[PDB]
Structure formats: C-alpha cells, structure tokens
Amino acid sequence: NREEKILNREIGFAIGMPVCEFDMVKDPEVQDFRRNILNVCKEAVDLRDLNSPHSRAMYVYPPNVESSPELPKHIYNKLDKGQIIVVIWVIVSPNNDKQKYTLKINHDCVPEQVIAEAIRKKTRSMLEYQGKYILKVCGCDEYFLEKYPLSQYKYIRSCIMLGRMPNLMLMAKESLYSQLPMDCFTMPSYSRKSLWVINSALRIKILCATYVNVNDKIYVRTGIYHGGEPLCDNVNTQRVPCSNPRWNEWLNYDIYIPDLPRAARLCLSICSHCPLAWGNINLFDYTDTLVSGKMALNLWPVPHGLEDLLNPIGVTGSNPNKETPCLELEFDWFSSVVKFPDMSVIEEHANWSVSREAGFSYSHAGLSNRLARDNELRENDKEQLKAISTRDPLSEITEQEKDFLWSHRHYCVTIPEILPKLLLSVKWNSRDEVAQMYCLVKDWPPIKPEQAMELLDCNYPDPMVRGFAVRCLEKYLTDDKLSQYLIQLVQVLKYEQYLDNLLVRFLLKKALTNQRIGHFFFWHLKSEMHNKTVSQRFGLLLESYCRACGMYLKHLNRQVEAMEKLINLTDILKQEKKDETQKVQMKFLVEQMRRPDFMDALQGFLSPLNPAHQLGNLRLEECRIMSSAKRPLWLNWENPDIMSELLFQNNEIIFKNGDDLRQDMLTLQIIRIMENIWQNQGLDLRMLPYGCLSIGDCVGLIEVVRNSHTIMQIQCKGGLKGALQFNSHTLHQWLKDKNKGEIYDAAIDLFTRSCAGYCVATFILGIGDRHNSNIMVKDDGQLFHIDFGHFLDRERVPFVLTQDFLIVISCTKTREFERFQEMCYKAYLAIRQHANLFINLFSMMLGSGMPELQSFDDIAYIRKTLALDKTEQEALEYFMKQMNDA
Ligand SMILES: *C([C])([C])=[C]C(=O)[C][C]C(=O)N1[C][C]N([C]C2=[C]C3=C(S2)C(N2[C][C]O[C][C]2)=NC(C2=C4[C]=N[N]C4=[C][C]=[C]2)=N3)[C][C]1
C-alpha cells in the first residue's frame, strides 16, 4: 500500500540495492531472518514510544557521557574548590538577541539544578516557570536531557581538561519536542528428527565441478574444522585431469558423527600445489539440522599471500556471483532428518560424566592427564592457573598446559577471566568434554566487556560461548563503550555462522534505542556493501534497521545522496579531467557544484563524521581540490546553528575518493583509547584522535582540525626565497611568535606532552614513517600526526625525534628532556598493562580485508614492541634502547 512502496524506495536508496532483490532470494534462512528480526524492531520502537516525548528525545539526542562520574585527581584540581564556571545563553527576542549568564556551580550538579541557578541570575535583574527547560551545547545538536552530574557529560569534561569555558544554551522543552516528528513503524508485507543416536563415521561425497576455466592435474582438498582448529586430519580426492572435472568420491574423515560440535565446518578448495579457488560450508544449518543430500557451492578466488591450500578463517557460504568455479557435493542420508541435541540432553550427558569422574580411583585418573583428581589441588598449581590467566591472547598454550587447565576446569570458575584459555584447551571433537564445557559455560560468572569481546573473535565459533560473551555485553557495556568498540563488534558479525544470532539482535536493539549508535551502525554496515562476501548479511540488517529507525532514514538519505554527488564529481576529475591545471580543475568544480540538483544535495544535511554537526550552505570560495594525486576535495560548510560563533562558524572536512581509510580509522580509534588509559592513569598526554570515517570502497571523510599546519608549512611560511628550507629553529620561533609572554610555557608543556604521546603510540603500533608533511602542530603548541598509512610492519621507530622537535622541548642534556623521557617511559608501561585490549581489538579486525592485518602473525608485532614475554623493568630498558638507536 501507498506508504510501503514509498518506504521501500527510501530503504533501497539508503542501502544501494532495491528491497525486491531480497524478495527474490529463495533461501529459508534469509526469508526467516527478514521475518524474525522484526521482533527486535518492535521491542525497540515500543521502548522509544514508552514515555513520550522525553523517551523519544533521548533516542534521537542521547546524552554523550563518560562511563563514570569520578574525575581523576588532576582533572578535579583544575576546578576552583571543585566548582566549574559555566556560561548559560538565552535567545530572548524574535530578533534573536543573545544574553549570557555566567555561573559558578558544583561540577557534579544535575542539569535541572544548573537551569534553576540560571533562572536565579536571570530573575535578579527584576527583583517562576520551573522545569520547562532543557540545556543544549551552543554550536551543535547535543542536549543534556538526562540527570547525570554535569562533569560526566563529555563536552563539559573536555572543557575542564582543556581549560575552556563551557557555553550552554537554555531552551524550552516543547521547542525541542515539536521538532521530533512522530515516526510510525509499520510491519511489511513479508512479515506474514533424530539426535546422537547415530553410530557412524562422517562421509562426504564430491561429485564434480563446473566453471573450472584455466590455461599438472586438478583435485579437491577438503577438511573438517572448528574455528581455526582442525577437528581431524584433512582429506583429499585423487588427481584427475582438468578437461573432465568429475570425481565421484566418498571421503572418510577421522570423526565420529556424534562428536561433531555445533559450529563444525567443512572447508574445501580446488587445487592444481596451488589453491585455485576455495569455499567453506557449515555442516549444521540455522535450524540445528545436520545438512544432508546433494548441494552446490560456488567458490571464491584465493586472497593474496595465503600459504595453506584451505581458507578456514575464510567466510562461509556460496558465492553470489554464479559465474565462478562451482562444486557439487553430496552428504549422507539416514531414516530421518538429524538434529543437534537439546541442552536438556547435553546436561544429562554432562551431569552423567561429572559424577562418573567423581568415582574414579587414584589409578584410573592415572591413565589420562586430563582427568581431575578431586581434593588434590595445591596452592602452587592454583597459582600456576593465575599466571596462565594473566598472559596475552597470542601466547601459545602448550598441550601440557591444556590438559592442566582442563583437569582443573572446575577450579577455573573461581578465576573467571581464564575462560578463553580454558576454551582453547578443550578437545572440540569430544562430545563428552564439549557437553561439560557447555555446562561450565552455562553458569560461568560475568567477565568484563573488554575481555568478553575476545570470545566473539574468529577463535571462538561455538554459539554457546558467543551467547555468553553477548550476554556479558548486555550486562556490562555502557553506550559510551558500545560506541567506542562499535566497529569491532560490527566486524565480528562476519564470523557468525547464521544470519539470525544473539549478537546481531543485540547490536540492532542498541542501534534502534540510540540514534548516535544507529548512525555509525548504518555507515559501518553501508561502507562494506561493495564486499560481496558480506553484502547479503549487511544488506538484510540494513533493511531491518532502515525499516525501524524512524525519521532518521530521511536524514541518512540526505547524507547518502551528498556522498553520491562527491563520489560522482571526484570520479569525473580523476577520469575525465585527469591532468589539467588547478585553475581549470577548480573552474570545472565550481561550475558543477553550482548546478541546481548538485547544489541542493550538497548542503543542509548532517555530517556523517558527527551527526550532531549540521552542515549548512557551502562556502565554495573556501572549497578546494588538494595536491594529493588521488584529488581529495577540501570542503567548507557553514554551521547554521544560531550560536555557531561559540563552537565554530565553519565546519570543514576532507573528502577522499581513491584510498582505503580503514587503517587510519582503526589507528585513530586506538589513539583515543590509549589517551583515555593515560588520562585515567593520571598523566595528561593530550592526543588528537580527529574524526575519520570510511563510507565505501576506498571512499571516506576526514575531520579538519582548525588552526593546524604541517611542519613543512611552518618551515616554508618562515623561509626566505632563494634559501634552503633546512632551518631547525624555525619551528621553535613559530611557536614562540604564536605563544608570546606567560603563555609560552603552556605551549612547550603541551608540545612535549603531546609529542611524548605520539612517540609512544607510533612506536608501539609501528606506524608508517613520519615526514615533515605527516606531522602537524596547532597554534597553541599541540603536536599530532595525520597520514597513518600502514601499521604492524630491527623493529622501527616511525617518529624519529629530529633536532627541530628536540629544541622545542628545551637540548638533549637538559632537565626538560629528562622529564620528557620520564613521560614516554611511564606512558609505554600503561599500554603494556592493557596489552590484551589492543591485541583483542586487532584480532576482531581480521575479518576486514585490511592488507596489513590478515593473519595473527601481523598482530604479533605488538607483542614485540610492548615486550610482553620479557619482564617490566627489562621492557622499559628495551624501549630505551630502540629510541637511542634512533
Ligand atoms: C613549502 C614547500 C613551500 C610549503 C608548501 O607549499 C608545501 C605544503 C604541503 O606540502 N602541505 C601538505 C598537504 N597540506 C594539505 C593537507 C593534507 C592533509 C591534511 S591538510 C589533513 N588534515 C586532517 C586533520 O586536520 C588537519 C589536516 N589530513 C590529510 C590526510 C589524512 C588524515 N587522516 N588520514 C589521512 C590520510 C591521508 C591524508 N591530508 C598542505 C600543506
């Protein structure tokens, strides 16, 4: 009906594919997903409409807050006896005259209390109307709707740290609520055995192949896997000529069918040894059914630099493009459909196995190193389990250590954080052990979200394990932290066996409960729709999101359309007008930007970098085509916020169409985390994790930091014509000229602190080497880095402290450089202590096709730079040596 067909066009524009493509998919799982996911949409809508309009205002404008109200000791010191000075603005006339009221208030004040005192100062002039008012940040669309202490709001904490005066606007409730239009979720047209009693070894037939188009013989190599680990020995068909690709071969593996775990996967590949193509298949379907009968798999091309003939970290499922090597399989058949057993059966088997081992005599337990001896665990080996739990995720557990953990599996519950080590020590090809592990996991106590995230990576495919990890996230993950780790959580969806799972339901709920979260959820999902390995999953999830997010769908289509214009325009530059002058390129740009359909599409929408930023009219006089060969556009928009002068009058963003910005995006995430760690640990090393967002196949947006210049910019602008640019003091003089008088010390102080941070950060992450063009400096002396090209690959210092920077700290033999060295040393230690977090963050990211991050071996570089297997004092000594080598 009318509204449904219009809604489909909108959704089709949002994603990039029409909805009716999903209607044509004749696959029970896809159609079930579309239908069954709608319960989450329904729940999310009902939560929003629960306590209107305030319930719906907090969905659209959620409070951007820190996870804790506790201020680190140095942050509290900046207050005047624990009190912050805030300025409160009121638009009083229809003429829009601004009146400011400055307050000195407690840092932990509730917004309502801050509004009360603002009215007290306003009423003083005259010598009523209580809580009909809300606070807004001047210059952007962020509100303080919730009853948090004022300091806990990020903006106000930033203003404390940076020393800035926070400028808030007082605003009437019904003005905001009026703007929130009544969205209307509607339901779409599409919305409406045997068990372990099988005594046999697993066979799989391989019938033939087609589309094996090529220039020795060929053969199919197969293997049965659980995650990265082979459940048994791999098995191969015979070498037969490529002219007649027909085998007809029942291959017998070394697995009892009853032992096949839930996430068991067949991994196959056609090989000439060189693997020509590959494919993986779940042996169980989404309904717990062991898959039987004839089946056809369209294979994928091999990725570059894949050593083994199989690809078990590879994504499961048939290729969308059916003009690729196709392989016809056939599985076994029995007297009925075979289903994986219920938890009740699994518990009965597990409880049976537990009491049987309770009765094992000394000698019986002698026969296997995996059998627990009850009441014979001493304090020495209890400490060994703690030491094993306190190691990194890339540390190899030996087969003796595995037997050992598993022997003491019941004691491991008293040290919950050991769980990922205990799960890797399980033999996932024993139903006896797996059933006990399920039971241990069922009652396993809650571990921190940071630690839980590891169990969603590619090492832990089992749904009972993943369900627990998701369950921890639901309990302990704040929306702040969800936003922070959102990109990793989006990636690990690729590792899920089925479209309908506990993780995707968790993320979608939050995306639909919190528009900040939904924004980036949409863009992260939309940027990989080119990647046919994930297009159907992400496409269907985007369909469900767009169908249920409300009016924000209209605002996303603005942004999508805006990016389509920029992608269209820059494609014309780097293809049609490839090597013309800057004048002729700029002329062409202006003429095409000024066309009516272009001109409306590129103004009056929300910044995809930060949707609280309204992008008004273009300042085309400030827009330019940049010197980088890929031709990134520098774009300047007006900020149409009434009090834009207070935050920033102009919002300017670099749009780039050509290069992969996913690496830069990951490095900037990490820099922010590292900084949070330091700021919580009490040392103020101010970093600068500016906005960076990938929106497609090598298309993306970069925030411009206002009042910033590269080192060469400082050297040239400060360098006489004819002369050479090599003058090292020129940087120090520039900072001296910008920061005259008593301000000078603060500039040098912020310069050292920021430099010590980017020294430590770049060394650890192994960033691409630093030019004078790569390093930047704000006018107040804040140093930071821009083009983070690659990471993770004797080990390199990327940021070699040349004289220029060292003279600004002072030059080597001084009290100023010693204190700076002590900043770097203490900084490096803090990240070592949190090594597991960063190791886990990178590990969740292997599903992304980032070239510098394909195998776990890539992540190992962090184990070398952080020096984990060494001691802490010897690790500080390692760092000292790598820097003095220079
Ligand atoms: C003398 C030789 C005469 C001086 C000159 O005339 C040469 C000037 C010069 O070479 N410049 C280098 C390029 N810049 C323009 C900029 C390029 C980039 C900028 S600014 C930024 N910024 C974003 C952050 O805010 C500040 C600026 N970023 C990037 C960029 C980024 C950022 N993240 N990832 C990423 C990848 C690629 C590029 N480029 C003029 C001076």
PDB file of N, CA and C and ligand atoms in Angstrom, residues 624 626 628 634 654 656 661 664 668 690 692 702-706 708 710 712-713 716-717 725 773 776 784 786-788, ligand 1:
ATOM      1  N   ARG A 624      38.306  23.551  -2.001  1.00  0.00           N
ATOM      2  CA  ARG A 624      39.421  23.359  -2.946  1.00  0.00           C
ATOM      3  C   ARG A 624      39.755  21.895  -3.259  1.00  0.00           C
ATOM      4  N   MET A 626      42.719  19.352  -3.556  1.00  0.00           N
ATOM      5  CA  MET A 626      44.014  19.283  -2.879  1.00  0.00           C
ATOM      6  C   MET A 626      45.095  18.636  -3.748  1.00  0.00           C
ATOM      7  N   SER A 628      47.255  16.132  -3.225  1.00  0.00           N
ATOM      8  CA  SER A 628      47.437  14.671  -3.240  1.00  0.00           C
ATOM      9  C   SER A 628      46.882  14.095  -4.549  1.00  0.00           C
ATOM     10  N   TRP A 634      38.778  19.393  -0.416  1.00  0.00           N
ATOM     11  CA  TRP A 634      38.658  20.088   0.859  1.00  0.00           C
ATOM     12  C   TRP A 634      37.376  20.850   0.760  1.00  0.00           C
ATOM     13  N   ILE A 654      37.726  16.975   4.765  1.00  0.00           N
ATOM     14  CA  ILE A 654      38.415  16.455   3.579  1.00  0.00           C
ATOM     15  C   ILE A 654      37.678  15.200   3.109  1.00  0.00           C
ATOM     16  N   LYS A 656      37.831  12.124   0.484  1.00  0.00           N
ATOM     17  CA  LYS A 656      38.847  11.410  -0.294  1.00  0.00           C
ATOM     18  C   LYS A 656      38.253  10.192  -0.999  1.00  0.00           C
ATOM     19  N   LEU A 661      40.677   4.144   3.778  1.00  0.00           N
ATOM     20  CA  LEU A 661      40.797   4.882   5.051  1.00  0.00           C
ATOM     21  C   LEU A 661      40.473   4.048   6.303  1.00  0.00           C
ATOM     22  N   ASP A 664      43.627   4.129   8.814  1.00  0.00           N
ATOM     23  CA  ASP A 664      43.587   5.412   9.536  1.00  0.00           C
ATOM     24  C   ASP A 664      42.483   5.453  10.592  1.00  0.00           C
ATOM     25  N   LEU A 668      43.184   5.735  14.693  1.00  0.00           N
ATOM     26  CA  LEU A 668      42.615   6.877  15.424  1.00  0.00           C
ATOM     27  C   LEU A 668      41.719   6.423  16.571  1.00  0.00           C
ATOM     28  N   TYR A 690      41.191  12.961  15.787  1.00  0.00           N
ATOM     29  CA  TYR A 690      40.211  13.617  14.911  1.00  0.00           C
ATOM     30  C   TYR A 690      39.326  12.592  14.200  1.00  0.00           C
ATOM     31  N   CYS A 692      37.538  10.330  11.517  1.00  0.00           N
ATOM     32  CA  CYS A 692      37.792   9.678  10.234  1.00  0.00           C
ATOM     33  C   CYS A 692      36.783   8.565  10.032  1.00  0.00           C
ATOM     34  N   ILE A 702      37.529  12.910   6.367  1.00  0.00           N
ATOM     35  CA  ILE A 702      38.489  13.227   7.430  1.00  0.00           C
ATOM     36  C   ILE A 702      38.133  14.583   8.029  1.00  0.00           C
ATOM     37  N   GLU A 703      38.092  14.670   9.351  1.00  0.00           N
ATOM     38  CA  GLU A 703      37.870  15.949  10.029  1.00  0.00           C
ATOM     39  C   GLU A 703      39.078  16.831   9.809  1.00  0.00           C
ATOM     40  N   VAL A 704      38.856  18.112   9.551  1.00  0.00           N
ATOM     41  CA  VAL A 704      39.948  19.080   9.569  1.00  0.00           C
ATOM     42  C   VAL A 704      40.028  19.662  10.975  1.00  0.00           C
ATOM     43  N   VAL A 705      41.223  19.644  11.556  1.00  0.00           N
ATOM     44  CA  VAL A 705      41.486  20.295  12.835  1.00  0.00           C
ATOM     45  C   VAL A 705      41.802  21.749  12.503  1.00  0.00           C
ATOM     46  N   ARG A 706      40.967  22.668  12.983  1.00  0.00           N
ATOM     47  CA  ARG A 706      41.146  24.096  12.705  1.00  0.00           C
ATOM     48  C   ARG A 706      42.438  24.604  13.346  1.00  0.00           C
ATOM     49  N   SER A 708      45.738  24.445  12.286  1.00  0.00           N
ATOM     50  CA  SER A 708      46.809  23.441  12.263  1.00  0.00           C
ATOM     51  C   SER A 708      47.578  23.473  10.936  1.00  0.00           C
ATOM     52  N   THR A 710      51.212  21.601   8.827  1.00  0.00           N
ATOM     53  CA  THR A 710      52.293  20.602   8.834  1.00  0.00           C
ATOM     54  C   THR A 710      53.609  21.295   9.181  1.00  0.00           C
ATOM     55  N   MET A 712      56.436  21.294   7.349  1.00  0.00           N
ATOM     56  CA  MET A 712      56.896  21.978   6.127  1.00  0.00           C
ATOM     57  C   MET A 712      56.173  23.302   5.893  1.00  0.00           C
ATOM     58  N   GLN A 713      54.876  23.339   6.200  1.00  0.00           N
ATOM     59  CA  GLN A 713      54.110  24.588   6.156  1.00  0.00           C
ATOM     60  C   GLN A 713      54.711  25.660   7.063  1.00  0.00           C
ATOM     61  N   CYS A 716      58.333  26.542   5.363  1.00  0.00           N
ATOM     62  CA  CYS A 716      58.172  27.396   4.174  1.00  0.00           C
ATOM     63  C   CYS A 716      57.638  28.782   4.547  1.00  0.00           C
ATOM     64  N   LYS A 717      56.475  28.823   5.201  1.00  0.00           N
ATOM     65  CA  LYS A 717      55.907  30.080   5.722  1.00  0.00           C
ATOM     66  C   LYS A 717      56.749  30.544   6.920  1.00  0.00           C
ATOM     67  N   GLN A 725      65.164  25.247   2.753  1.00  0.00           N
ATOM     68  CA  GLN A 725      64.168  25.049   3.829  1.00  0.00           C
ATOM     69  C   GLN A 725      64.734  24.421   5.119  1.00  0.00           C
ATOM     70  N   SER A 773      55.776  16.617   6.347  1.00  0.00           N
ATOM     71  CA  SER A 773      54.392  16.700   5.851  1.00  0.00           C
ATOM     72  C   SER A 773      53.357  15.848   6.622  1.00  0.00           C
ATOM     73  N   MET A 776      51.873  17.430  12.368  1.00  0.00           N
ATOM     74  CA  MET A 776      51.225  18.740  12.440  1.00  0.00           C
ATOM     75  C   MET A 776      51.281  19.301  13.850  1.00  0.00           C
ATOM     76  N   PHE A 784      50.501  16.628  16.636  1.00  0.00           N
ATOM     77  CA  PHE A 784      49.765  15.410  16.258  1.00  0.00           C
ATOM     78  C   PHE A 784      50.125  14.932  14.855  1.00  0.00           C
ATOM     79  N   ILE A 786      49.049  12.840  11.081  1.00  0.00           N
ATOM     80  CA  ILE A 786      47.898  12.743  10.158  1.00  0.00           C
ATOM     81  C   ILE A 786      47.792  11.484   9.297  1.00  0.00           C
ATOM     82  N   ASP A 787      48.710  11.263   8.364  1.00  0.00           N
ATOM     83  CA  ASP A 787      48.511  10.205   7.369  1.00  0.00           C
ATOM     84  C   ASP A 787      49.083   8.906   7.918  1.00  0.00           C
ATOM     85  N   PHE A 788      48.263   8.191   8.688  1.00  0.00           N
ATOM     86  CA  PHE A 788      48.643   6.892   9.253  1.00  0.00           C
ATOM     87  C   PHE A 788      48.432   5.848   8.166  1.00  0.00           C
TER      88      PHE A 788
HETATM   89  C1  LIG B   1      56.717  24.911   1.097  1.00  0.00           C
HETATM   90  C2  LIG B   1      57.354  23.681   0.499  1.00  0.00           C
HETATM   91  C3  LIG B   1      56.605  25.987   0.046  1.00  0.00           C
HETATM   92  C4  LIG B   1      55.358  24.583   1.714  1.00  0.00           C
HETATM   93  C5  LIG B   1      54.385  24.076   0.739  1.00  0.00           C
HETATM   94  O1  LIG B   1      53.811  24.835  -0.015  1.00  0.00           O
HETATM   95  C6  LIG B   1      54.058  22.608   0.694  1.00  0.00           C
HETATM   96  C7  LIG B   1      52.797  22.402   1.539  1.00  0.00           C
HETATM   97  C8  LIG B   1      52.429  20.946   1.741  1.00  0.00           C
HETATM   98  O2  LIG B   1      53.104  20.090   1.199  1.00  0.00           O
HETATM   99  N1  LIG B   1      51.353  20.591   2.511  1.00  0.00           N
HETATM  100  C9  LIG B   1      50.963  19.176   2.743  1.00  0.00           C
HETATM  101  C10 LIG B   1      49.453  18.989   2.482  1.00  0.00           C
HETATM  102  N2  LIG B   1      48.642  20.000   3.198  1.00  0.00           N
HETATM  103  C11 LIG B   1      47.199  19.814   2.989  1.00  0.00           C
HETATM  104  C12 LIG B   1      46.637  18.740   3.882  1.00  0.00           C
HETATM  105  C13 LIG B   1      46.627  17.457   3.577  1.00  0.00           C
HETATM  106  C14 LIG B   1      46.047  16.621   4.514  1.00  0.00           C
HETATM  107  C15 LIG B   1      45.548  17.290   5.634  1.00  0.00           C
HETATM  108  S1  LIG B   1      45.883  19.003   5.383  1.00  0.00           S
HETATM  109  C16 LIG B   1      44.932  16.519   6.672  1.00  0.00           C
HETATM  110  N3  LIG B   1      44.359  17.098   7.817  1.00  0.00           N
HETATM  111  C17 LIG B   1      43.274  16.395   8.542  1.00  0.00           C
HETATM  112  C18 LIG B   1      43.426  16.639  10.045  1.00  0.00           C
HETATM  113  O3  LIG B   1      43.267  18.042  10.231  1.00  0.00           O
HETATM  114  C19 LIG B   1      44.376  18.790   9.769  1.00  0.00           C
HETATM  115  C20 LIG B   1      44.689  18.472   8.295  1.00  0.00           C
HETATM  116  N4  LIG B   1      44.899  15.181   6.501  1.00  0.00           N
HETATM  117  C21 LIG B   1      45.351  14.527   5.427  1.00  0.00           C
HETATM  118  C22 LIG B   1      45.266  13.041   5.307  1.00  0.00           C
HETATM  119  C23 LIG B   1      44.751  12.194   6.396  1.00  0.00           C
HETATM  120  C24 LIG B   1      44.271  12.390   7.687  1.00  0.00           C
HETATM  121  N5  LIG B   1      43.991  11.209   8.196  1.00  0.00           N
HETATM  122  N6  LIG B   1      44.238  10.269   7.365  1.00  0.00           N
HETATM  123  C25 LIG B   1      44.723  10.772   6.238  1.00  0.00           C
HETATM  124  C26 LIG B   1      45.152  10.192   5.043  1.00  0.00           C
HETATM  125  C27 LIG B   1      45.619  10.976   4.036  1.00  0.00           C
HETATM  126  C28 LIG B   1      45.709  12.356   4.156  1.00  0.00           C
HETATM  127  N7  LIG B   1      45.913  15.250   4.424  1.00  0.00           N
HETATM  128  C29 LIG B   1      49.038  21.357   2.791  1.00  0.00           C
HETATM  129  C30 LIG B   1      50.491  21.572   3.214  1.00  0.00           C
END
